[PDB]
Subunit: 156 residues, 10 copies
């Protein structure tokens, strides 16, 4: 039977324990996700309390991190999502993505409406990936792809 | 000589005027950016108060929209950026992008650090584009590409 | 060509002007929406700045309320949605619906996950209606039906 | 003698404990409420700290979830209601209901006034239900009924 | 036909105009409410944007204050209630009532549950009045009576 | 020697403990206050962290509730007052009193100035009481009397 | 007949107008208050919208500043007090007084309780004054005296 | 070597421990400060986490309160100052001082500039004291003296 | 006679007008400050509403910018300082300096106390300068000097 | 393999423990950084939760402060940066730096754009240092150098 959470702190506290174990074993997120059949971004989000893992995935990652049974079960719960402590991130790495919204948010709105119509780009029927690409002028770039279904707003 | 703003309302007010003229002319953002030599997302952001236009681009969009001289000059000013009224968007279209951050912000941090290192993905050495694609299951998807330079944090 | 707004105040100001005209004409929302082929709740939301009217509906309500042509154009624009002044309503009538959320919000979450699965009930592929019904104890009850598409959360 | 709470955290902590036990026993809200005589939405709210259970109902769910005596007594206290952590939900599932208020809040006010009069729809003399119905276009919809008593404001 | 407002500023701007007129004419709230058949507290609230006046009363006070026809019509509209600028009053006079709530809010909850039961004391089926009474130790006291209908929580 | 607190959580945690004991003993606030020689509203406020009890009163209620010595001492400390978790109550019962302020706050100010003059109605030289009265139309009413000293504001 | 305000902006706009006139006439606050029979701090507070001037005082300062009749009448209105734009001052001069509260707030509470008892120091039965004193170490000191009536909190 | 704090909770937790000890020993702030060679307002602020004590004073109050060695050392650390829980005090005694700023803040600014010049009155080169005096009308008054260095603005 | 402001909006509106003039005349801040005797950062801050100009400087910049006489007088007013619209900047340029505080704020505190002692570094007895320096790795660096007086916190 | 944090409280709690050990040992930040090969400002930031230490430095400081192995590993984790408790500092020492931004933020933006162009001064490719100098008038000044890479905003 599906199970769900109502207070994010239980899974965020689990996330912290996970991260300590991960550090102690010197694991990467890529290796934790290996063997689950699920994308790195998805599995990582689950560990960090933002997604639910299927039972087999939860058992796999649970073994890798030496998690107790309650933790493995907690990983299967539908989370109370929301990773940002207090609405606006303080962390520079997280903050840049918020800044992308402060600069381009209305442009995204305008261009969504022009290209698709009234409605939204989904954050649920949605996937994300992060790719590293050499910058021709020197150094490295992140190409982050947000891929969401268009959901139209129609009269009724 | 470069000129900058300190109060977003001057350029946001201009944005409203631009949008009224745009609607009265039945123009698209694509048509407006055509011929400027600049990406639709960049020109649109400028119109909306979030970027500066080079003088030739400002004159051209100003011709297409019948803008007065002060307005064409204002478009060339470096803006006081920040498109969101009060930190968290109320508009569903804009809000979904903020929700992507509430769900995946910590995952983005974790994967940026694993793939690149301690530091940030730049919102300044940065570009974005919105592409409409088919959903294999039916309907349409937005593929929004965020492309930013990795800026490392190294000890001193 | 589709036209969108980025500052809610343009359409909220129009809403105030529409309400003054409506009051002067002693009109109801039911009669305004009559003949548009659209639901009362949708046409009302549009007048109040929260939905876009198709051109024919816009012209029709425009005639009923003696609106100028800038106003009839504005009603066709995709809004910058968000009717609540500052996050939490002050108005008792509006506040009670927010109280429903403070009391039953987590129960809605819990029951949605149990009955449907991980995911959301859409606010976009969505309709609502308000019905007045006798209370068996005397007085009257409102039966407000929220009817939203189940959007499943699917793992990638 | 009736007993009441003043700090939501006591019951919200109990809720988390109840959810862990529920998950360990692989129980549904439907099953837990069965035998209480009370609607699934009401019993669920109680478990989640938002309603009081009568003594016999408290004892029944207590036995089902292996709760201790203090916990069974706490479930009978009139709660300090308010399930939302910090005014605006972060969770996408809960957020959609808040968005419904950002879009339709003023429409609900207007239509309540037109259909009933000056006053409010109650969240306290109130019932909620969640039904799943097939969507004719494919997939599923939630039909959520908010049924509240109309309370008029009349002059004095 | 009933008419309603959605933006408090229209009626609050009217209130300021009413106050200037009232001051120019050196009138009291008592005098203004005389002849309306309505309590001084109710009429005063209406003038200040927090209640609607019936047509006859609107015309009466309108004549007293030399108000125009749009103003008299606006007083008849069901307001978007909420008199406090930004949630917590700054004015010492208004603040003391807020402080009463900070000191006795939980006591009021507890005693209401004890004396009446689970539910609320209505702010809608509600009257209030302000009386001046001599203080036996010297000076004067305000006896402010809040008189609301007990609305019991209805299980389901 | 008088003793005061600076951190509300200490007395609020005690309040939670008092309420558990109270519920275990199935006691009323009326009976707890019996024999203290003090008003139910004052004693209740003390238990809930918002007033200090005189030593004899503290010992009396402490005996009734089986409190330890640290607790009986804490009840005598002048509290760091403020019962509302985060400025605006979430609980419906408490919220109604806040709504009274949102609706009538400026009316209270206006009538206080008219009936008394410039200044305030005291929250300190102050008493309140809650009375249950039959409603002639059926059910019950709460008559809550706020009784405050007028403190004038005069030039210096 | 006493007259009162409910929106601070009316008197704060007047204040700005007063300050412009004052600057154009190169007047001091000391001189504006001379002949009024009222303290400099009181009259200044009134000009700045935080106190009300008696009629004679209003006419006197109004002639000095060349104010119109509506402005002189406004100065006589009981204000909606609250000079700080958004709770915490941004201005360094004003901020220091807020910092004094952040550093010594709990100390003031503690010493007030020790020296006087439970209750408050009045901000209404209150005066203040600002004196310049030479610092023996060089420069100048401000000696700002807050002088308020003790208001005891007693059991009832 | 000087030692400093970065999280106020360490010293505020210590403050609570100090106040419990102080209550158990029935001590006054005056008595605690006696023999330290420091003003009671300074010592009290240190106990409450808002100032640092020199070693000899720290050991002396530590003896009077039976504090352990880590606690005596903590008292010598430069604090992370800020006594107010969440910017605006809820406690009536503390709130009154905030209200003095809401009523007189702009007056203080204006009179500081007129009597001293552009700049600030220091909250650092600063002392304060609380004196109890007789009110000539009956009762008692607090004379609270804020004594700060004038810091002129330095053009460059 | 010294003159001061209480509402930042008066000088910020002047700042916007200044910036339009400056743009139209294609002037730099460097050149506007030339001949005033005041540092570019000081004169710029004045134009932007954060410092006062002496009369000669106000006349000089006034002539350069074609300002009217009221504007020239307003520049001499002691401002109500605070350039950030709503506490946390939205503009990326401004935000980076806030981020420096988010990352290094506690380090600055710690190293100020170790190097100087208990106290503060002044923003009032203060100078600022910005210098462009070649980056040896390519590009340019800003070397920004904050030079403030150390104000010790000593016991009393 | 790099390891990162998502909850600042883990490293901030470690910082508090570090500071206690540092006080007990009577150590300076200068001493602690000695022999790391890293600047005092960088190592201090690390201890305080705002930077990561390389493994060798982590072991060196860990030895000096008697930290356990989990603590030494924690210091090597990439932090969730953000040292300010709630956006605006309460601590006077920290606050002055925020006040530098309230006074000069818009000036910094303006001069950055004039001297460098559209874009930012980096908080990442960044360093800072704090220097103590004599003040010519007596006392001491802090010269704090911010040194950041210019990151241009260019069209695409
Ligand atoms: Cl990825
Ligand atoms: Cl694009
Ligand atoms: Cl409907
Ligand atoms: Cl249901
Ligand atoms: Cl009355
Ligand atoms: Cl009572
Ligand atoms: Cl004075
Ligand atoms: Cl003292
Ligand atoms: Cl410079
Ligand atoms: Cl340094």
């Amino acid at each position: 039977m599906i199970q769900s959470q109502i207070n994010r702190n239980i899974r965020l506290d689990l996330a912290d324990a996970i991260l300590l174990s991960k550090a102690k074993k010197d694991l990467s997120f890529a290796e934790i996700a290996d063997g689950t059949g699920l994308a790195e971004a998805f599995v990582t989000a689950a560990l960090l309390g933002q997604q639910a893992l299927p039972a087999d995935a939860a058992r796999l990652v649970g073994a890798k991190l030496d998690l107790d049974e309650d933790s493995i079960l907690l990983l299967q719960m539908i989370p109370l999502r929301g990773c940002i402590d207090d609405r606006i991130p303080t962390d520079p790495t997280m903050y840049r993505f918020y800044e992308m919204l402060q600069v381009y948010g209305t442009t995204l709105k305008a261009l969504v409406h022009e290209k698709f119509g009234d409605g939204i780009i989904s954050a649920i029927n949605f996937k994300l990936d992060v790719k590293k690409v050499a910058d021709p002028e020197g150094g490295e770039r992140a190409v982050i792809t947000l891929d969401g279904k268009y959901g139209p707003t129609k009269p009724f």
